[PDB]
Amino acid sequence: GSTRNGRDSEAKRLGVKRFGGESVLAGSIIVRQRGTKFHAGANVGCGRDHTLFAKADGKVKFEVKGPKNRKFISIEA
Amino acid sequence: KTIKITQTRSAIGRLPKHKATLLGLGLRRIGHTVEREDTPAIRGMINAVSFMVKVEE
RNA sequence: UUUUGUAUAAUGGGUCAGCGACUUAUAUUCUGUAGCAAGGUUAACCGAAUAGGGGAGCCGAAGGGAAACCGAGUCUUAACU
RNA sequence: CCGACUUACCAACCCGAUGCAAACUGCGAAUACCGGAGAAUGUUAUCACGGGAGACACACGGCGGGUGCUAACGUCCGUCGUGAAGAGGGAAACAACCCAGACCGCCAGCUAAGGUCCCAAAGUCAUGGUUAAGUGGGAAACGAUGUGGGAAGGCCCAGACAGCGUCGAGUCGGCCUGCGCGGAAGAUGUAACGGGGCUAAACCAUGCACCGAAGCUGCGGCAGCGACGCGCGUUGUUGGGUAGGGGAGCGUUCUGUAAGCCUG
RNA sequence: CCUCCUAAAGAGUAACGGAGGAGCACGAAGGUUGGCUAAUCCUGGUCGGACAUCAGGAGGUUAGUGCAAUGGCAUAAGCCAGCUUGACUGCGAGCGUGACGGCGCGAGCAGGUGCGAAAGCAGGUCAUAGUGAUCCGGUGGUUCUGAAUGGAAGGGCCAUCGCUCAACGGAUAAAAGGUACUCCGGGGAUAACAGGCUGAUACCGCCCAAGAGUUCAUAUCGACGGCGGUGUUUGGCACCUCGAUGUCGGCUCAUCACAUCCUGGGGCUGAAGUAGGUCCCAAGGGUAUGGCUGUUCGCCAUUUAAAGUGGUACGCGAGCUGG
RNA sequence: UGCCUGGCGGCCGUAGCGCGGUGGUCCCACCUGACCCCAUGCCGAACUCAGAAGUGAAACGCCGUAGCGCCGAUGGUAGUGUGGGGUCUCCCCAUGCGAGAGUAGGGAACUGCCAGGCA
Numbered sequence A: 001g002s003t004r005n006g007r008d009s010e011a012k013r014l015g016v017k018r019f020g021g022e023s024v025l026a027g028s029i030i031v032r033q034r035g036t037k038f039h040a041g042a043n044v045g046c047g048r049d050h051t052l053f054a055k056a057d058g059k060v061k062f063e064v065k066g067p068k069n070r071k072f073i074s075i076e077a
Numbered sequence B: 001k002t003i004k005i006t007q008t009r010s011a012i013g014r015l016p017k018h019k020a021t022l023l024g025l026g027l028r029r030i031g032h033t034v035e036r037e038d039t040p041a042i043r044g045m046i047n048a049v050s051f052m053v054k055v056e057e
Numbered sequence C: 001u002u003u004u005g006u007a008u009a010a011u012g013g014g015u016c017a018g019c020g021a022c023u024u025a026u027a028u029u030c031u032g033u034a035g036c037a038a039g040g041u042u043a044a045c046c047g048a049a050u051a052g053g054g055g056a057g058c059c060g061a062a063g064g065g066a067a068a069c070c071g072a073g074u075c076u077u078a079a080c081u
Numbered sequence D: 001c002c003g004a005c006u007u008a009c010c011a012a013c014c015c016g017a018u019g020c021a022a023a024c025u026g027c028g029a030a031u032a033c034c035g036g037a038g039a040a041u042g043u044u045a046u047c048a049c050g051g052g053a054g055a056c057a058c059a060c061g062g063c064g065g066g067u068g069c070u071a072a073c074g075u076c077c078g079u080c081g082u083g084a085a086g087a088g089g090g091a092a093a094c095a096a097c098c099c100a101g102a103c104c105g106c107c108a109g110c111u112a113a114g115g116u117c118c119c120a121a122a123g124u125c126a127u128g129g130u131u132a133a134g135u136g137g138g139a140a141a142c143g144a145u146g147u148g149g150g151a152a153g154g155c156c157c158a159g160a161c162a163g164c165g166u167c168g169a170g171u172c173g174g175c176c177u178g179c180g181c182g183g184a185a186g187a188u189g190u191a192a193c194g195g196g197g198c199u200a201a202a203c204c205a206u207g208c209a210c211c212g213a214a215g216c217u218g219c220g221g222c223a224g225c226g227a228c229g230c231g232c233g234u235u236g237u238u239g240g241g242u243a244g245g246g247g248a249g250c251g252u253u254c255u256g257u258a259a260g261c262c263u264g
Numbered sequence E: 001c002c003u004c005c006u007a008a009a010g011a012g013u014a015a016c017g018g019a020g021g022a023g024c025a026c027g028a029a030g031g032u033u034g035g036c037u038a039a040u041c042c043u044g045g046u047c048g049g050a051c052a053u054c055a056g057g058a059g060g061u062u063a064g065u066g067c068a069a070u071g072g073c074a075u076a077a078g079c080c081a082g083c084u085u086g087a088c089u090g091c092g093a094g095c096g097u098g099a100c101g102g103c104g105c106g107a108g109c110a111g112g113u114g115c116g117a118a119a120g121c122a123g124g125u126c127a128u129a130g131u132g133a134u135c136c137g138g139u140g141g142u143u144c145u146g147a148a149u150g151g152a153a154g155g156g157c158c159a160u161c162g163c164u165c166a167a168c169g170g171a172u173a174a175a176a177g178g179u180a181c182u183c184c185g186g187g188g189a190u191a192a193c194a195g196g197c198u199g200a201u202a203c204c205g206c207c208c209a210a211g212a213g214u215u216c217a218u219a220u221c222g223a224c225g226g227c228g229g230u231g232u233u234u235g236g237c238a239c240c241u242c243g244a245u246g247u248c249g250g251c252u253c254a255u256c257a258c259a260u261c262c263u264g265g266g267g268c269u270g271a272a273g274u275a276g277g278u279c280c281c282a283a284g285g286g287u288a289u290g291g292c293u294g295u296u297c298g299c300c301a302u303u304u305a306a307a308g309u310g311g312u313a314c315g316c317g318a319g320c321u322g323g
Numbered sequence F: 001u002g003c004c005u006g007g008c009g010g011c012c013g014u015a016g017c018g019c020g021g022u023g024g025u026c027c028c029a030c031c032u033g034a035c036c037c038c039a040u041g042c043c044g045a046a047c048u049c050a051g052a053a054g055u056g057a058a059a060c061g062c063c064g065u066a067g068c069g070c071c072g073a074u075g076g077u078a079g080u081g082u083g084g085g086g087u088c089u090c091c092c093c094a095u096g097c098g099a100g101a102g103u104a105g106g107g108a109a110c111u112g113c114c115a116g117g118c119a
């Protein structure tokens, strides 16, 4: 007859906006994410929704770093 | 060195990327022979559409 | 004709002849073309006058601001890097 | 107040083995996507802005899936192809499959898919095999000394196997595999190769011929776009199209040109 | 509106697909400084037990997160305390995401502030739901405007308030039904009939053989399961027909299939005979009348060698009937 | 220049555990006391301060040792882009890419700056 499902939320367009080696202007969003899947490295800020954004003009650099092998995003300015 | 490349089959029904490659080689129709420089870039194009071109080398 | 798709057993037409469907007015924008050009153009009307007169107006040469207002600036803001 | 033996016994944790997962992941591709660089090639194929739209019923096929019965020529997504809006050749006939994109003409040529005994264009082609079922040319579990190939065994002239010690040569049944057989009943008429017919004219392998399209080439012609030269030449390339956009024309009636011009 | 999966390792991606949540909460549950680290179990211990609190150890986040799910989180984003109001005002390089309206992220600048010795951090909260355009009107501020002039009214601007407008891009401030008395424009874009595709279901075969059959699976039957065939019931789908493809049953007239009811041939039998059972071959011909009911069917009566089963637009209304 | 110790990094398990040693001159640790500075939702346990008699017991560092964790070929397998094929619910062929798991094996980290002790 009827079903109790049939709901879903709008897709949030998360994920990587600027990949490795891409030249960005300061302020450019590099990744939108839920929590810190990626962490802010050098010249990268972490917004209130865990958005990583460039704090300097330069090139995006993904790196695995530290004792937990966490993924950091940096900007090579 | 230059290589002669002849188109042997139709582009009709081929993938867009394959049509783009034939355009990249400058092949216009079945039987059209073009003379191109033997470079890795040209060889990769041939490789991508090797089923529908013949290389005389 | 309509359709994803019609020989279709979907639609329409018995045939011929004649008639039968994107117009007209005004406004507005764009294009072309012609005139004149930081100007362009007149409306009613007058004029027997397609002339000539009539520049009332309209558009343009300045914008910004809700506005007062300021003005190659202006608004925003107590003030802008 | 307790305890102690005790179980057809039911048993968590932990340990060792075994699987399973769209909403599991201590792993993790191919692809795809984003960015950078470099050639060649491509009628700028790109982006922006402005004039004009149409369209917002899609269909099938392939691949990845949800749903459904991994039912539907079903339904709903993703992605590519074709149809739509695409003729030609093939698939008997057959939008959507295969081949292939029709500017025009030719009583030239070469090919594609697909074919070559007759209908019907081209091999009654070659070589080696398989099938005997018209299998080919509809159908499963399963059944069976059909028949071909391969590897390996048991037993055997100290006589095996079958028949009745005799008898003198092989016998026995598993394995893997090729092709067949049964399983296999439907309604107008053969009617489940398109038909004739076929024992290859079937199937497999190999090879060389040929046929075969509106594909390609040849010859002649027309037009669009772009170069490079001086509207002309030379040269490159393009010309299937519905909605629809753009360009250029034909003819009709009427007005001027026209008291002209044609007309008993 | 949010979260996951479907979703094909960028984004996005449908279904009356599979699962759950939201329409808030919080002046601390916000800011900052300083500090801290979980579940669970084992051993011991007043009451005290499986589980309270205490002590030690094992363990290592298997906890926790104001509330779903996912992704995060130890430098914790988790837990505790001090001081606080950055849950600041004006702006904003740049970027994400949207058809748009919008929505989001944001360093930095100015002013003023909190916490910290300081570097610093703070424009709410681990993040992602907790929402409502415009109009109309309300309240406070602001001489911006003020229809002769000065005022004022009203308007503007800034701040803010009023919607389960939840059918949530929100037709109106304000709205239920009937039509077999019906009507128009349309559609085979879409149902009812028949056809088609399909074959779950149905019907008919077959495979395995537990077992029943005194004994004995296979005379006969065939549990648990397995594989097909037909197009044949109930359905699924919506491809043909809505500028009409007349419909149940009967009557008349049929025609084909064979899965055979009778008659014909045959094997097996748990076949003495008679008469059966079962299977194979066989479609030549044959194959009830009545009672009841619109019935088809069915039950009943009485026949018959038998009273077959199906297909044919559930054969047959330009052939009849009209229950 | 070697050996030891401390601090701060690189790196983020070949680097971590376990298990057997081993070190006190120096350094480190525990340690010794607390009217003090500061501290305990109780407690000088911690934090903090004033110290140096004692011990390396614990911890810590170092060394050894595969029982683990960890790393890990080669080959094969799975998957898969493109093209092609079949008996098409699934496969196969050509070509390109090629895991995961497991196997052999590796494996008791390595390294920069500064300071101090010793030789």
Ligand SMILES: C=C[C@]1(C)C[C@@H](OC(=O)CS[C@H]2C[C@H]3CC[C@@H](C2)N3C)[C@]2(C)[C@H](C)CC[C@]3(CCC(=O)[C@H]32)[C@@H](C)[C@@H]1O
Pocket (backbone or CB within 6 Å): E192, E193, E244, E245, E246, E247
């Ligand atoms: C009018 C249509 C009729 C004569 C009858 C029709 O039956 C119906 O449509 C049932 S509704 C019924 C039909 C007529 C007209 C009004 C009233 C209602 N009643 C007297 C009926 C049985 C079908 C169900 C639909 C298709 C039909 C063709 C074939 C068929 O069996 C017909 C149509 C196309 C036919 O023209």
Ligand SMILES: [K+]
Pocket (backbone or CB within 6 Å): A017, A018, A028, A029, A030, E095
């Ligand atoms: K960006």
Ligand SMILES: [K+]
Pocket (backbone or CB within 6 Å): C003
């Ligand atoms: K139609």
Ligand SMILES: [K+]
Pocket (backbone or CB within 6 Å): C010
């Ligand atoms: K009709």
Ligand SMILES: [K+]
Pocket (backbone or CB within 6 Å): none
């Ligand atoms: K106009």
Ligand SMILES: [K+]
Pocket (backbone or CB within 6 Å): none
């Ligand atoms: K003009």
Ligand SMILES: [K+]
Pocket (backbone or CB within 6 Å): none
């Ligand atoms: K400005």
Ligand SMILES: [K+]
Pocket (backbone or CB within 6 Å): none
């Ligand atoms: K598809």
Ligand SMILES: [K+]
Pocket (backbone or CB within 6 Å): none
């Ligand atoms: K096409």
Ligand SMILES: [K+]
Pocket (backbone or CB within 6 Å): D134, D137
């Ligand atoms: K045959």
Ligand SMILES: [K+]
Pocket (backbone or CB within 6 Å): none
């Ligand atoms: K707080």
Ligand SMILES: [K+]
Pocket (backbone or CB within 6 Å): none
């Ligand atoms: K500030």
Ligand SMILES: [K+]
Pocket (backbone or CB within 6 Å): E167
């Ligand atoms: K609505």
Ligand SMILES: [K+]
Pocket (backbone or CB within 6 Å): none
């Ligand atoms: K009404």
Ligand SMILES: [K+]
Pocket (backbone or CB within 6 Å): E205, E206, E228
């Ligand atoms: K059967």
Ligand SMILES: [K+]
Pocket (backbone or CB within 6 Å): E216
């Ligand atoms: K028996």
